[PDB]
Design a protein around this ligand. Structure first.
Ligand SMILES: *[C@@H]1O[C@H](CO[C@@H]2O[C@@H](C)[C@@H](O)[C@@H](O)[C@@H]2O)[C@@H](O[C@@H]2O[C@H](CO)[C@@H](O[C@@H]3O[C@H](CO)[C@@H](O)[C@H](O)[C@@H]3O)[C@H](O)[C@H]2NC(C)=O)[C@H](O)[C@H]1NC(C)=O
Ligand SMILES: C[C@H](N[C@H](C(=O)O)[C@@H]1CCCN1C(=O)[C@@H](N)CCC(=O)O)C(=O)N1CCC[C@H]1C(=O)O
Ligand SMILES: C[C@H](N[C@H](C(=O)O)[C@@H]1CCCN1C(=O)[C@@H](N)CCC(=O)O)C(=O)N1CCC[C@H]1C(=O)O
Ligand SMILES: *[C@@H]1O[C@H](CO)[C@@H](O[C@@H]2O[C@H](CO)[C@@H](O)[C@H](O)[C@H]2NC(C)=O)[C@H](O)[C@H]1NC(C)=O
Ligand SMILES: *[C@@H]1O[C@H](CO[C@@H]2O[C@@H](C)[C@@H](O)[C@@H](O)[C@@H]2O)[C@@H](O)[C@H](O)[C@H]1NC(C)=O
Ligand SMILES: *[C@@H]1O[C@H](CO)[C@@H](O)[C@H](O)[C@H]1NC(C)=O
Ligand SMILES: *[C@@H]1O[C@H](CO)[C@@H](O)[C@H](O)[C@H]1NC(C)=O
Ligand SMILES: [Cl-]
Ligand SMILES: [Cl-]
Ligand SMILES: [Zn+2]
Ligand SMILES: [Zn+2]
Lengths: 602, 604
C-alpha cells in the first residue's frame, strides 16, 4: 500500500522526529492486521487460517523492509548521536529488519515453518486419545502411579518432539540468516540485545549462583519425599529425580506434588483447589476476581471488548485450539484479549493473574507510539501479574475471598506456606535459566542437530537434577515438546521475572505502608502501591529498564536479595531438615536412570 | 635467598632493564638448575626424601621469582611495554609474572606439597589382583589384549586407582593456582595458559580448525566402530552409539595405532607395523635413540652431547626403584646437561615417542645460548611439533625400508591407503582428545565446572568430541580426568592439538625446501641439509620473536592452517567416506546415552 510506504524526510534530528511519528502511524494498521490473523488461527487451527496468517506475515515484512531501508538511507550516518534518547531507542529499533532481511522465497518458507511447528505442537495427541491440555496436564498433576505418569510423559515427548525436529533445524538456519544482516552474530544475540546490558550473561550467572543453594535444598527435600512414595527402585537418593514425577510435564514447577511433601501435614490445606470446585467457581469467576484485584489498586478494569472477544474456556465444538494461555494486544488501543483453556484450580487462578498482568500493561501504554508498546524489558511484562498473584496466594487474602478458613499465624503455617511457594517459584528457576541456554547454543552453532537432545539433557541434568525416565537418543527432540520452542517465544524473560517479581513485591509492600514479614504482605486495596505500579506500566519501553527499575525499587539492577528475604525462613528450615535425614545435596550419581516398570507398557 | 642470588639496583629505564636482565640471567640459571636437578632426582627415584628436597628447591625458586619479580615491578611497571628492544620486553614480561610466587609462604608450601603428592599418586598407582603398573603392564594390556574383560579390568582398575585419590588434591590445587594467577591480573589460571599464544581470537581460531577436521574424525570413527563390531559383537558395540573407551588400544583412547591389525583395509600388502620386526631383529632402547639421533645429524642438526648419553634414563630401572615412567625431555638450564627420561619399550610407537622427545632436546640444544627467559618454543605447540615432523618422514614405508625395518617396497593405491589409515589412527584419532582436555580444564579454572561436576563434564566432553563412553558406570566419586598424566602433573594440553595441526604445515614446508616433488605423504626429508637449515632457523629463535612471524618465515603463512593436514590425508579421507557410505554407516553416535553391559561374572 502507497499510504503505508514511507515519506520523504531530511537527515537530522528534527527530520527524524517527524519520521518516527510517520512510522508509528502506519505500523499501527500493519501490526493490527498481523495480530488479527494469528488470533483467527490460534482459536481455530486450519489450513485456511494458516494461509491468512502467512499473508499477514508477508505484509509485515514488506512494511519493515520499506521503513528500515528508509531509516538506513536517512539516519544510518547520524542516529547514535541524537541528544534525545527516546528517539535513539525508536530509530535503532526501526533499522533492525529481522526476517525482513530475507529474500522473498525464504521469507515465505520461514512464515510456513512457524505455522507447521505451531500446528504439530498444539494438535499432538497420546493414544492407546489424550491431548496435552487438559488430559495429560491433569494426569501429570494428580496421578501417583509411576507407570501412568511414565506413559503420559513418554507419549507426549514422543508425539510432539519427534516430528518437530526436521522443521526446527530449517527454522534455525533461516532465522540466523535473517538476523546476521542486522549485524548480529546470530538470533540469540538479537534476543539478548533486548536487555541492553553488556554483562547480561555474566549477570544472570551471578544471579543463578546465589539462588542455586535454595534449589539444591528444595530438590533434596522433595527427592526424599518421592523416595518415601516410590521406593529405592525408582528414586536414587544420590541421583537425578525421574523427570515425570514432579507434577508437571516439564518438571518446571512442582506445586502439584505439595500434598506429598507438605512439612506439617494436618494443618489447613493451603491448596484451595478442592474448595474452588466445592463452591462452583468457573472460568468467568476467576477472571472477575483477578480484575477486581486490579481495580482495587485503581488500575483499569478490563474493557467490554475484552469480555466480548476473549476465549476463556476450551471450545466444546470439536475445534483445535492453541491451549497454551496467552494475552493479545491488537495495536488498536481498543482490542485486548486472553485465550486460555481455563481449568478450575489454584494454579490456573495464578495463570489468570499472570495473563491479566499482560493485559493491564497493554491498557496502560495503549496511547504510545507502537514501538514503545512493549515492556521496559520482556521480563517486566512477565512479572506484572505474578506480583499481584503473590498477594493473592497469601493465606490471609485467600481467607478474604472465602477460599480458606483463617489460619493461625504460627511458625508451622509459615513454613507450610513458604514451602508451597518454593515448589512454584524456586523449583522453576533452573528451568527458567536453562531453556535459553539450550537455544542460545543452537542459534550459535555450538549445538548442531546431531546434539540437540544430548545438550538438552546435559542442561536438564546440570541445572534441574532430573533425568529422562526412558532412554532417549537423537531421534527424540525433547526441547520441541515445550510450547515456547516450536512457538519461537524466548524464555530467559521468565527467569528474569521470577527474580524481578520479588523486587517489585518488596517495593510495592513498602509503598503500601505494610510492615510485617515480606511473605505475608497483601497489597490489595493499596492505591499507593497501585500508583507506583501504574508509573511502570505507562512508561512502556520509552525509557531504559534500568532507570524504570531504579525509580520503582531504588536499585538499577536485577537482584536476588528480595527473593532470598521472602523465602529466608523456609530456606533456613529446609537446610536443617536435609542434614537430619543426612541428605546428599546434588546428584553425584549423574549417570543414573530409573529402570522401566514391569512389562511396560501393558 | 642467597645474597649473590638477590637483585641489586638498576635505573628506572630501558638501559637499567638490560643490565637487570643480564644480572637475572646469571642467577636464574643457577636457580633453574637446582630446581630441575631436584625434580630429576625425584622423578627417577621417587622417595619421601627426594620429594622433600624437590619441595625445598621449588620454594627457593619462588623466593627468587618473587624478589626479581617485585623488583621488575618496582622499576619498570609501566615503561616495560614501551621498550624499544622486543626481546627485552619479552624477558621483562616473563620476569614480572610471579605465578605461585604471589602466594604467601604457607600457601606456597601447600601448593608445592600438592604438586608433589599429585605427582606421586599418579606415578605410583597400581592395579591389584601382585600388582600391575601403568607402564609397562597396563599399557601392554590396552595395546594387545583383545579380551573385552581383561581390557575392562585394566581400564577400570587404572581410572579408579589414579583418579579417585587425586580428586580432593586437585580441588585444592585449582583454588591456589587461581589465587596465584589472579594477582598477576589473569581472570583464572586457564587465561594465563592461553596468553602464551598471544592471540585474542585463540579459542575461536581453534574452534574453526576443529570444524574442518571433525568430518575426517567422524568417518575414521565409524569405520573403526564397524571393525570392532565384527570382532566384539552386537552386545558390546553399538553401530549407532559411542565406542567403549577401553577398546581403542590406549588407556585414554587417544590414539588408535594399536588396533591397526584389526582395521587394516588391505592385509595382503606389506605389514606397516614393524614392531614384530624390531623384536625379531633384537632392537633395544639404545638402538632406538641412536637411530633417532642419526636422523637429526643427517639434517646437519646437532648430535646428542656426551652428557645426554651419560645422564639419561632410557629404560625402566630393574634395580627395584619407583620412577615416573611418562616420557619427558629435560633442560637443566646450564647449557650443558640435557636428558631424556623414558621407560622405553621396543615398539614402533615408542620409536615415534623417542623422536618426539629428541625433538625437545634438539630445540634446547639450538637455543641454549639465548637468555634463560627466551629458552622456550615460539609457542608451546612448536616445541611439541619438532620431533613429530621428523617422525612423519621416519614412518614412511620407503624410510623404514632404508633402516632395515621393511623388506618389501610397494607403491600402489592399496599400500597407500594402508599407510594413510595407519597414520590417521595415530594423528586424526588424537585430534578430539587433544582439543577436549583443556576445554575441560579451562572450565574447571574458570569455575564453570565445580568439583560436583568434574566427572560429569569430563564425560560430556569425551562423548561430544571423541564419541566414546565409559565401559562401567561412573559417578562423581570418580575423577577420570585425573587418570591422565598431564592433569595431576599440571602440564597444559592444548599445545598437542596445536602441534598435530602445525606438524603438517612444517612437513609440507620442509618437503618443499628438500626439493621433494611427489605426494606429501611419501616425502622423507632424511639427509636433506636444506630442510635441516630451515628447521634450524626455527629452533634457534626460541621465544625471542612472535610465533606468527617465525611461522610465516618458515611456511609462508602467519597462522595455524588445517590445509596441509587435509592435503596429506586426502586419499584416505575420500576412501573412508566412500567405504562408510557403501556400508550404510551412521556417522556420529546418535544413541548418545548408550553404554555397554558388564561381562557375565566380571571380574571373577
Ligand atoms: C609412487 O608413485 C607416485 C605416482 O607416480 C606417477 O603415477 C603412477 C601411476 C605412474 O604412472 C608413475 O610412473 C608416475 O610417476 C609417484 O608420484 C609422482 O612422482 C613424480 C616424480 O617425482 C611426480 O612428478 C613430478 O611432478 C612435478 C609437478 O608436480 C614436476 O615438476 C616434476 O618434474 C615431476 O614430473 C608426480 O607428480 C607424482 N604424482 C603424484 C600423484 O603426485 C611417487 O613419487 C612414487 N612414490 C615413491 C615413494 O616412489
Ligand atoms: C502461560 C504463559 N503463556 C505465555 C505468557 O503469558 O508468557 C504466552 C505464550 C508465549 C507468549 N505468551 C503471551 O501472553 C505474550 N503476549 C506475552 C508477551 C507480550 O505480551 O509482549 C507461560 O508460558 N508461562 C507462565 C510463567 C511460566 C511460563 C511457562 O508456562 O512456561
Ligand atoms: C610423551 C609426551 N610426554 C611429554 C612431552 O614430551 O610432551 C612430557 C611430559 C609432559 C611435558 N613433557 C616434556 O617432556 C616437557 N619437558 C616438554 C616441553 C618443554 O620442555 O618445553 C606426551 O605426553 N605426549 C606426546 C604427544 C601426546 C602427549 C601424550 O602422550 O598425551
Ligand atoms: C504474624 O506474626 C508476626 C510475628 O512474628 C508478625 O510480625 C510482626 O508484625 C508487627 C506488626 O506489623 C511488626 O511491628 C513486627 O516487626 C513483625 N515482626 C517480625 C519479627 O516479623 C506478623 O505481622 C503477624 N501478622 C499476621 C498476618 O497475623
Ligand atoms: C532411538 O530410540 C528409538 C525408540 O526406542 C526406544 O529407545 C531405544 C534406544 C531402546 O533402548 C528402547 O528404550 C526403545 O526401543 C529407537 O526406535 C531408535 O532405533 C533409536 N535409535 C535411533 C538412531 O533413532
Ligand atoms: C634414591 O634416593 C635415595 C634418597 O632418597 C638415595 O639414598 C638412593 O641412593 C637413590 N638411589 C639411586 C640409585 O639413585
Ligand atoms: C559411585 O560408585 C561407587 C562404586 O561403583 C560406589 O561405591 C559409590 O557409592 C558411588 N559414589 C557415590 C558418591 O555415590
Ligand atoms: Cl526475552
Ligand atoms: Cl599450551
Ligand atoms: Zn506471560
Ligand atoms: Zn612433548
Amino acid at each position: 500500500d502507497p499510504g503505508l510506504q514511507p515519506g520523504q524526510f531530511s537527515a537530522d534530528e528534527a527530520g527524524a522526529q517527524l519520521f518516527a511519528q510517520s512510522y508509528q502511524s502506519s505500523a499501527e494498521q500493519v501490526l493490527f492486521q498481523s495480530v488479527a490473523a494469528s488470533w483467527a488461527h490460534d482459536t481455530n487451527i486450519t489450513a485456511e487460517n494458516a494461509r491468512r496468517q502467512e499473508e499477514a506475515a508477508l505484509l509485515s515484512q514488506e512494511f519493515a523492509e520499506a521503513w528500515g531501508q528508509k531509516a538506513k538511507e536517512l539516519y544510518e550516518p547520524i542516529w547514535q548521536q541524537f541528544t534525545d534518547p527516546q528517539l535513539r531507542r525508536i530509530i535503532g529499533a526501526v533499522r533492525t529488519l529481522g526476517s525482513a532481511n530475507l529474500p522473498l522465497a525464504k521469507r515465505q518458507q520461514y512464515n510456513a515453518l512457524l505455522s507447521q511447528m505451531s500446528r504439530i505442537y498444539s494438535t499432538a495427541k497420546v493414544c492407546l486419545c489424550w491431548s496435552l491440555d487438559p488430559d495429560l496436564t491433569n494426569i501429570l498433576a494428580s496421578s501417583r502411579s509411576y507407570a501412568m505418569l511414565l506413559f503420559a510423559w513418554e507419549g507426549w515427548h514422543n508425539a510432539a518432539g519427534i516430528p518437530l525436529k526436521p522443521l526446527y533445524e530449517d527454522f534455525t538456519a533461516l532465522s540466523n540468516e535473517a538476523y546476521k544482516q542486522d549485524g548480529f552474530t546470530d538470533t540469540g544475540a538479537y534476543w539478548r540485545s533486548w536487555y541492553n546490558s553488556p554483562t547480561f550473561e555474566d549477570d544472570l550467572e551471578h544471579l543463578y549462583q546465589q539462588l542455586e543453594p535454595l534449589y539444591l535444598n528444595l530438590h533434596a527435600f522433595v527427592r526424599r519425599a518421592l523416595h518415601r512414595r516410590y521406593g529405592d527402585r525408582y528414586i536414587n537418593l544420590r541421583g537425578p529425580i525421574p523427570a515425570h514425577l514432579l507434577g508437571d510435564m516439564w518438571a518446571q514447577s512442582w506445586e502439584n506434588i505439595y500434598d506429598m511433601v507438605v512439612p506439617f501435614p494436618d494443618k489447613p490445606n493451603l491448596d484451595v483447589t478442592s474448595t474452588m470446585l466445592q463452591q462452583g467457581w468457573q472460568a468467568t469467576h476467576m477472571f472477575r476476581v483477578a480484575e477486581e484485584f486490579f481495580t482495587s489498586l485503581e488500575l483499569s478494569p478490563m474493557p467490554p471488548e475484552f469480555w466480548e472477544g476473549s476465549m476463556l474456556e476450551k471450545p466444546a465444538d470439536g475445534r483445535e485450539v492453541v491451549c497454551h494461555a496467552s494475552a493479545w494486544d491488537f495495536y488498536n488501543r481498543k482490542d485486548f484479549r486472553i485465550k486460555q483453556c481455563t481449568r478450575v484450580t489454584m494454579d490456573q487462578l495464578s495463570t489468570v493473574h499472570h495473563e491479566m498482568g499482560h493485559i493491564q500493561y497493554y491498557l496502560q501504554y495503549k496511547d504510545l507510539p507502537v514501538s514503545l508498546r512493549r515492556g521496559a524489558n520482556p521480563g517486566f511484562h512477565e512479572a506484572i501479574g505474578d506480583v499481584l498473584a503473590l498477594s493473592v496466594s497469601t493465606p490471609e487474602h485467600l481467607h478474604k475471598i472465602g477460599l480458606l478458613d483463617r489460619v493461625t499465624n504460627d511458625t508451622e503455617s509459615d513454613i507450610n506456606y513458604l514451602l508451597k511457594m518454593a515448589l512454584e517459584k524456586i523449583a522453576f528457576l533452573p528451568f527458567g535459566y536453562l531453556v535459553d541456554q539450550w537455544r542460545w547454543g543452537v542459534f550459535s552453532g555450538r549445538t548442531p542437530p546431531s546434539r540437540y537432545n544430548f545438550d538438552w539433557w546435559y542442561l536438564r541434568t546440570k541445572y534441574q537434577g532430573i533425568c529422562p525416565p526412558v532412554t532417549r537418543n537423537e531421534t527424540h527432540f525433547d526441547a520441541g515438546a515445550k510450547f515456547h520452542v516450536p512457538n519461537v517465544t524466548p524464555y530467559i524473560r521468565y527467569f528474569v521475572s521470577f527474580v524481578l517479581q520479588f523486587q517489585f513485591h518488596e517495593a510495592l509492600c513498602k509503598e503500601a505502608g505494610y510492615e510485617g514479614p515480606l511473605h505475608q504482605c497483601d497489597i490489595y486495596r493499596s492505591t499507593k502501591a497501585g500508583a507506583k505500579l501504574r508509573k511502570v506500566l505507562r512508561a512502556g519501553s520509552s525509557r531504559p529498564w534500568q532507570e524504570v527499575l531504579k525509580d520503582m525499587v531504588g536499585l538499577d539492577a536485577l537482584d536476588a536479595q528480595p527473593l532470598l528475604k521472602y523465602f529466608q525462613l523456609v530456606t533456613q528450615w529446609l537446610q536443617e531438615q536435609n542434614q537430619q535425614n543426612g541428605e546428599v545435596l546434588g546428584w553425584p550419581e549423574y549417570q543414573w536412570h530409573p529402570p522401566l516398570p514391569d512389562n511396560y507398557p501393558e
